[PDB]
């Protein structure tokens, strides 16, 4: 009915790498930061 890929709780500024919503675009940035310093060995995603 109202459950699945398309549910009730999606934001236009929700991270995709990890997934984190925020009240405002500007805010998102601050978060996206964690996706800059993080220095993974290699095979992480997937
Ligand atoms: Zn993220």
From Swiss-Prot:
It is found in: Nucleus. A zinc finger (C2H2-type) spans 13-35. Belongs to the krueppel C2H2-type zinc-finger protein family. The C2H2-type zinc finger 2 to 6 are necessary and sufficient for discrete Cajal bodies localization. The C2H2-type zinc finger 5 to 10 are necessary and sufficient for interaction with LSM11. The C2H2-type zinc finger 2 to 8 are necessary for interaction with the SLBP/RNA complex in the histone pre-mRNAs. The C2H2-type zinc finger 2 to 10 confer activity in histone pre-mRNA processing. Interacts with the SLBP/pre-mRNA complex but not with SLBP alone. Interacts with LSM11 in a U7 snRNP-dependent manner. Involved in histone 3'-end pre-mRNA processing by associating with U7 snRNP and interacting with SLBP/pre-mRNA complex. Increases histone 3'-end pre-mRNA processing but has no effect on U7 snRNP levels, when overexpressed. Required for cell cycle progression from G1 to S phases. This is Zinc finger protein 473. It comes from Homo sapiens (Human). The gene is ZNF473.
């Amino acid at each position: 009915g109202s459950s699945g890929s398309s549910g009730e709780g999606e934001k236009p500024y929700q991270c995709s790498e990890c997934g984190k919503s925020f009240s405002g675009s500007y805010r998102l940035t601050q978060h996206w930061i964690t996706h800059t310093r993080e220095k993974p060995s290699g095979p992480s995603s997937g």
